Every structure is written in structure tokens, then in C-alpha cells.
Design a protein around this nucleic acid. Structure first.
Length: 340
RNA sequence: UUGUAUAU
């Protein structure tokens, strides 16, 4: 299968091989483990003349290289360092194939790279080829990265169709391992008329979402980047349940984000809840300090509590200081107390 | 190494 030239190249007969010397052999080298790398390194410091020579041989069969295990890297390099005309030509070779490349293990990488460097007109045209296949792409291991990329690179106005497709299924997608990702990208880049519906559904299912393996990340995202109004709705769902959620493998993380990003009043109230409320033997705080997950919440509470309130928290912990040593997680609270 | 998610 390999030509003499490539054959000899792999055998090291050409230690000083230059781009111009593999003329007529570009496609072959590109689909070869070492040949590809050989081309990729020459493409970054090659005269636009040498680059065109390489371009001439891959344009026609560009797609074949896009879905190639080693060839997809040569195409990516042109989208990044090639000329504007070369990027546009490759873009034309992609036309009509966006969907299949987006779901392709190697091609999805080309699509993502292309979206980053082509003009808005070519981006929009690429995006439109996904019209009608949004959920299929969002749920695909390769395709979800292309959708995320669209969301971060394309004018949010051209993404409305993705928003339309997400309406009514936000809860379902927020617990999906790829969907939770796309949803976080939508919250960071889309327009208010587009994030509003998404947020309304996230609020509707906050209770289930904070406890979900993936949904908890979506909720934490809102706490770390959302508007105060959205952050407050989330904090309101958490209050009254601090103790229980603090002991949950997934929701405990959301409790921490609430403590950290809540308003001054909200923060004081969440901490007080566990300083006042009693849990069977002793207060909620004591049970929290001995728990495998809640001990982290107590520490976050010590860190952000205001001086006056930190004092209250310390006094609550104080009496248990000697006993804490006998518990796996209590010990970790003792360590935290050291600094204080 | 006291506790959870993205790919050549």
C-alpha cells in the first residue's frame, strides 16, 4: 500500500526530508502515522508557497482526510494556519457533510476547528445543516462537542433552533452526561429570551437536579455565574434542607456553592439553620461535622461566615473538639480548626 | 492523597 518514498521515509532513509520533496505524495503521507506529523510540523513554519503545494493535493479528497485517524490533523492545521482562501475552500468541501462529520470521531474535530476560524456566513451555513438533528447531536459522544462549539462561536441568533429543541426537555438534558454540558454553554452565551425558558425549567426541577450526578453541575453553574435572582431561587430550595443535602454525595456540592455565592442575608440564614436546628442527639452542625460529605460544608461555612457569625459557629463546635478525634471525618474538622 | 462530569 505504501509508496517507495513513504516506505523509505518510515525507514529513516530521509532524515532531512522537506515538504517539496514529497510532492505527489501528500495524501499518502497524511494518512500515515509519521507522515501526518511530518506534515503538521512543516505547516507551521512553511512559506505560504509550500503550504499551497500541500493544499493543492488535499483539497479534492479533503473529506477523506477529515474522517481519517491521522489525516484529520492536517485539515485542522489549515483551518488554523492556512490562508483565508484555503479555509473557505475547505469549508466548501464540508458543505452537505456537516451532520455526518459532526457525529464522526475524527471529523467532529475538524468541524469544531472550522467553526472557530471561518466567517459568520460559513458558520451559519454549517449550523443550519444541523437543523432537525439537535438532540441527536447533543446526545452523541462526538456531536455534543460540535454543538457546544457552535454555542460559543456563532451569533446566538442562529442558535434559536437549538433553544427551540431544548424547550420542555431541560430537565431531561440537564441529567444527561452530554446535555448538562451544552446547557451550561447555553447559559453562558445565549440571549435572555433564550436563557429565560431554560432557567424557568431548571428552577422547576431544582430539587431533583441538585441530587443528580450531572444535574448538580448545572445548578452549581447558575450559582457561580447566574443573576442574583436565579441564585436566590436556588438558595430558597436549599434552605430548610441544609442538613439533609449536606450529607448527599452530589447535593453537598450545591450546598457549598449556595453558602459561597449567596447574598449576605442568605448566607447568614443558611449557617444559622444548622447552628439552631438540632439533630437527634445534638445540633445539625455536629452530625454534619462527622459526615463524609457534610464536613466539607461546615468548613466552607467557617470560611465565608462573617466574623460575628464565625464566632457563633466556633462556639457550637467547641464542646465536641475532644470527641471529634474519634471520627473519621471529625478529624478533618479539627485540622480546619487549627488555622483558627 | 477525607467527596461527583467532556472526547483523537
Amino acid at each position: 500500500g505504501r509508496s517507495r518514498l513513504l516506505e523509505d521515509f518510515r525507514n529513516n532513509r530521509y532524515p532531512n526530508l522537506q515538504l517539496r520533496e514529497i510532492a505527489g505524495h501528500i495524501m499518502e503521507f497524511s494518512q500515515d502515522q509519521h507522515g501526518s506529523r511530518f506534515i503538521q510540523l512543516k505547516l507551521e513554519r512553511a512559506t505560504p508557497a509550500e503550504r499551497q503545494l500541500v493544499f493543492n493535493e488535499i483539497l479534492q479528497a479533503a473529506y477523506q482526510l477529515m474522517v481519517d485517524v491521522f489525516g484529520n490533523y492536517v485539515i485542522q492545521k489549515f483551518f488554523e494556519f492556512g490562508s483565508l482562501e484555503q479555509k473557505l475552500a475547505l469549508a466548501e468541501r464540508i458543505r452537505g457533510h456537516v451532520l455526518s462529520l459532526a457525529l464522526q470521531m475524527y471529523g467532529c474535530r475538524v468541524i469544531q476547528k472550522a467553526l472557530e476560524f471561518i466567517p459568520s456566513d460559513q458558520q451559519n451555513e454549517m449550523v443550519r445543516e444541523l437543523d432537525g438533528h439537535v438532540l441527536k447531536c447533543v446526545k452523541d459522544q462526538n456531536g455534543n462537542h460540535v454543538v457546544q462549539k457552535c454555542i460559543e462561536c456563532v451569533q446566538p441568533q442562529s442558535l434559536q433552533f437549538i433553544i427551540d429543541a431544548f424547550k420542555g426537555q431541560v430537565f431531561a438534558l440537564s441529567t444527561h452526561p452530554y446535555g448538562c454540558r451544552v446547557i451550561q454553554r447555553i447559559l453562558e452565551h445565549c440571549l435572555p429570551d433564550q436563557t429565560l425558558p431554560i432557567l424557568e425549567e431548571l428552577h422547576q426541577h431544582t430539587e431533583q437536579l441538585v441530587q443528580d450526578q450531572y444535574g448538580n453541575y448545572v445548578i452549581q453553574h447558575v450559582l457561580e455565574h447566574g443573576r442574583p435572582e436565579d441564585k436566590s431561587k436556588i438558595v430558597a430550595e436549599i434552605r430548610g434542607n441544609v442538613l439533609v443535602l449536606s450529607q448527599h454525595k452530589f447535593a453537598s456540592n450545591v450546598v457549598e456553592k449556595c453558602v459561597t455565592h449567596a447574598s449576605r442575608t442568605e448566607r447568614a440564614v443558611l449557617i444559622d439553620e444548622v447552628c439552631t436546628m438540632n439533630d437527634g442527639p445534638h445540633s445539625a452542625l455536629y452530625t454534619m461535622m462527622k459526615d463524609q460529605y457534610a464536613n466539607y460544608v461546615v468548613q466552607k461555612m467557617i470560611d465565608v461566615a462573617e466574623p460575628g457569625q464565625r464566632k457563633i459557629v466556633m462556639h457550637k463546635i467547641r464542646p465536641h473538639i475532644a470527641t471529634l478525634r474519634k471520627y473519621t471525618y471529625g478529624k478533618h474538622i479539627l485540622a480546619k480548626l487549627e488555622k483558627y
